[model samples]
Target: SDWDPVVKEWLVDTGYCCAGGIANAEDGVVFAAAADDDDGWSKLYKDDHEEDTIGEDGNACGKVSINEASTIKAAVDDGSAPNGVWIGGQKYKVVRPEKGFEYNDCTFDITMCARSKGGAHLIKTPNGSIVIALYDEEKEQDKGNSRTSALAFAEYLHQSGY
Candidate 1:
């Protein structure tokens, strides 16, 4: 099975920066991969831990990294995430993924961050292969420019064809 250019470029390109499946596109939205020209991907850390991951209450995991990278990435690397499951898009995937968003505005590359980092709610097709996300209504507007990029990327997920 083949994915869209946005998928190929972000999750599988020279700097495939994401989750444990680093560089393995055949896995259908594999979340992990070695970043472009970076070190090996880490899977043992499992930084998905966060309070109310699915928003059982009303708290969305919408804290921009107090530091520089994704809390998820940071956690796996250093043994702990910032204070949330996902970090702000700009903090980690910005600048680079922002360009990817503009390139494929309607794609999961950014939407993935919105849901995972922005803590936005998600709507997904069966098997979790296709996704539709809404920016963390509780937090999106507060992130400033990063939120803008997250929203734009989220908007294009469906159009990006997963």
Candidate 2:
């Protein structure tokens, strides 16, 4: 049972699961949470597409959390949201992908993002929360199994106090 869903899994492997509600990343769609490869990304481009049966939360999902989100959300949204926003001593970059979930209500667009919905992060909307999330950057898994530096970028950010 080999399962993998590239872009969709990004949501799973990274922050979507921790998201509290539905989440989306890029052109892909998924429930919430989980990373790695097993199931291919849930297709979201189609009209009236089927919802993901998998639900949310998976082995690969990573999570981070933000404090004072209401105030922070405001800070992050101002001035072009330049180079991601820094709040509560954390710096978060912006990635706009709708989970395009559309799970409960087709009109809601699954809390809305990937399609009619848009950019999301940790706290939800404006979007994506700084608290409880995985950094949304591409990680290379092309190497066989383990690479010592697989998370080099992430580690760097952490050490640098981002």
Candidate 3:
């Protein structure tokens, strides 16, 4: 619960993310997560540590594995990650990758072909990765704010040597 206040302040309270979570880069283990009365994020954490399959809760979407963190890095570097990015256990199709960063501080428009999609801010840290998810249906803007929030916190974490 130590990370709850931090995640709530940086991501959710910023109004840039509807749901956010921190996953260990080496294992895809979500150690900290938060959502604003959301139906899915809580379910995501519940399913993340349980088993391989997901969506059994009727709200949670996809599966999360240990290799997912590495998978995202490689996929994005080769430009094949336009496929999908998982946040809160739901896979959102990446519409396009925003330029400016290589494998770190990458921002994507994950709203392609989905009614419940928005933006995703992903950054690789020393120990793990941070995923900030924004849902447009919830009135959160993902154009830039999400990236800012995600990157800012990640940057702080990076500088702190985490």
Models ranked on lDDT: 3, 1, 2
lDDT for each residue of candidate 1 in 17-92, tens digit (9 for 90 to 100): 2311212222223342332223313321233333332244757755332321244333232333335423322222
- Candidate structures ordered by TM-score, highest first: 3, 1, 2
- Checking candidate 3 for backbone clashes, the offending pairs are 25-128
Q: Candidate 2: misplaced stretches above 4 Å? A: 1-80, 97-101, 106-120, 123-132, 135-162
How does residue 69 of candidate 3 score in lDDT?
45
Q: What is each predicted model's overall lDDT from 0 to 1?
A: 0.30, 0.27, 0.53
Query: What is the per-residue lDDT of model 3 for residues 137-157, given as tens digits with 9 covering 90 to 100?
Result: 467465566766777777666
Once superposed on the true structure, which residue ranges of model 1 sit more than 4 Å away at CA?
1-142
Off by over 4 Å in 3: 38-83, 97-117
Cα RMSD (angstroms) for every candidate in the order listed = 12.4, 18.0, 6.9
9-73, model 2: which lDDT tens digit per residue? 33444433312112222212223322333322221111231222222452434333322232233
